[PDB]
Amino acid sequence: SQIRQNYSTEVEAAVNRLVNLYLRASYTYLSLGFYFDRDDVALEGVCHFFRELAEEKREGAERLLKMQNQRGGRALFQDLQKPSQDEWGTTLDAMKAAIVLEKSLNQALLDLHALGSAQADPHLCDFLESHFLDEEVKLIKKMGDHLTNIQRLVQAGLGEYLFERLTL
Amino acid sequence: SQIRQNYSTEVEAAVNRLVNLYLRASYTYLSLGFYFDRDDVALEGVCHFFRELAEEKREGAERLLKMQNQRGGRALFQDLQKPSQDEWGTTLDAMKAAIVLEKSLNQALLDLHALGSAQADPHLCDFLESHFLDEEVKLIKKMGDHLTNIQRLVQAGLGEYLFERLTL
Amino acid sequence: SQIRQNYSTEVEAAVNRLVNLYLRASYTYLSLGFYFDRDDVALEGVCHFFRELAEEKREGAERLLKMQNQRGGRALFQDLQKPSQDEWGTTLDAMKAAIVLEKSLNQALLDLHALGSAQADPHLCDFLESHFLDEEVKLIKKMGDHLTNIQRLVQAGLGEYLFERLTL
Amino acid sequence: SQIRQNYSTEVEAAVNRLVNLYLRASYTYLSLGFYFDRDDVALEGVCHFFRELAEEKREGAERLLKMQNQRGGRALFQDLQKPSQDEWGTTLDAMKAAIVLEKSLNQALLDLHALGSAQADPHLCDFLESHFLDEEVKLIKKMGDHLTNIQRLVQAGLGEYLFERLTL
Numbered sequence A, B, C, D: 001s002q003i004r005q006n007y008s009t010e011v012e013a014a015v016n017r018l019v020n021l022y023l024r025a026s027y028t029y030l031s032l033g034f035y036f037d038r039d040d041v042a043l044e045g046v047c048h049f050f051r052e053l054a055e056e057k058r059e060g061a062e063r064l065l066k067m068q069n070q071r072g073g074r075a076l077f078q079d080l081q082k083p084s085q086d087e088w089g090t091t092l093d094a095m096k097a098a099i100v101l102e103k104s105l106n107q108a109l110l111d112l113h114a115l116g117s118a119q120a121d122p123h124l125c126d127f128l129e130s131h132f133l134d135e136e137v138k139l140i141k142k143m144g145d146h147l148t149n150i151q152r153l154v155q156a157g158l159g160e161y162l163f164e165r166l167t168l
Ligand SMILES: *CC(F)(F)OCC(F)(F)F
Pocket: A023, A024, A025, A026, A027, A028, A030, A054, A055, A057, A058
């Protein structure tokens, strides 16, 4: 590419992998959201919480793709695997799966940062530090807070209703 | 001091002690607030309640310091001891510790008032009666009200959540 | 902590130390401010300059504490030592002590950054670079500018009055 | 008087004396103000400072007279002695005389408070504490601040001009 400068093939490939990860995460949240929209689950605040996250993760993928083109890398898309579950259980079960998912995204961001440091790619470093790293830390904190409140409320049916009504 | 009039050394020293007490109280509320911000505690209304009190106590210290200078006394600062606990337990535990703290501040205000009366210092009397005594009485009443509601709600996890959501 | 990821015990402890440093700095500026409010010193612009800095340093401590909780670290508070002086001399003396204080905070920030780099903690790096490092550089520059103007003005009483009136 | 209750003859007489003192003080400030309006003195900010105080002291007398009637006491007016000087020297000389004057008013307020305490007259106590005691403390502090700045500026002609221009 005529514009490519200081952009390693290793980072280019890792950015493509991270896009697949973010799109996978968006798909997982789409599934979570619609599960809570089921007439036999029916927790609107939980559905909305996850649908909002689906959007956020899709936007993350799009930010990575824009950056890939800015650096003169080439987007390569792969199959997107279906979410790990078809049914997500209680709000607690779902929030547990969500924090696991966010930690995996966070670790992937940290790995990419490490790669960028190794390749002396300060533009990549800044990009991740600016658009991703703190967003992830904040989200994981919020999920931790929710998990604690969910667990304090477990009795169980009453707690799930109240959390959806009064927190979400 | 060129401006000093009817301002005893005993009151000057007691005012300095009271400043240390108010700053200690601010520090204790800072600790309480951040404890409730922990991801494994996560009671936002409780955190906000105590952070607001940290501010109020700091402002009290500043009011005392301004008055000290107005009277021609000299501010003398001492080490500030760390709060009595690192972890504050339940909302109930915390509110109990808070009312204990406020009663100690109140007693210190009353002792200073008594000292002012003994020294026939009506400006000091007015200062305390105007800026501190009723504020303390009102705060202690509010904490008493909270304690009663907390105790009525104790089961326990559900009660703590509901109090934070619906009162704080 | 359920949320903790890539957050070393070394950084957690250093963050706690830095909180103590910032609170110490706030206390030092509180003392500086009220000294200049003395009827026998009476430099209102100087008092306001330092009282504003007390607030800024307290806010820095609070930012560090919020971050500590975001990362799943645990705030640990220690005794706060009293400021190094009870009386602060001239505006020049005070500004000299202030720049010494800011340089020590700056060095502590740089040490923490180095620690973060060694622990490959890019979130910490970004946090410090975003909220602290440039604020410190700007503040130290402003103090340097003031010192130069103060020194140019030293005769002495006239210079101190004019600097307070026309710069502060 | 049909309305008189718990109002001693001693307090009634002391209130009349205090009125004479406040009117004397107003007259002294009138003289100070017009001295600084002299073409051979010509310090407008100083003239305005003292003319404002003349008004404040007259208003104090009027407040005391209103209170006297509220309590069913009887106003008794006496000759008003002329101010202690015809010419007031420098700004420094004048401010020195002003702080002496304010301290004498303050002492008179404190004596009246003591008298009220001895006569168990809480309405009088409140009246003085509310309308006079803190006003006096604040004024004396401000004069102390001015004296310090004046003295720092003394060379002499330049200092007097600058203080009038930049503080008053
Ligand atoms: C965000 C989600 F995965 F759901 O959607 C991805 C795509 F299919 F591209 F819309």
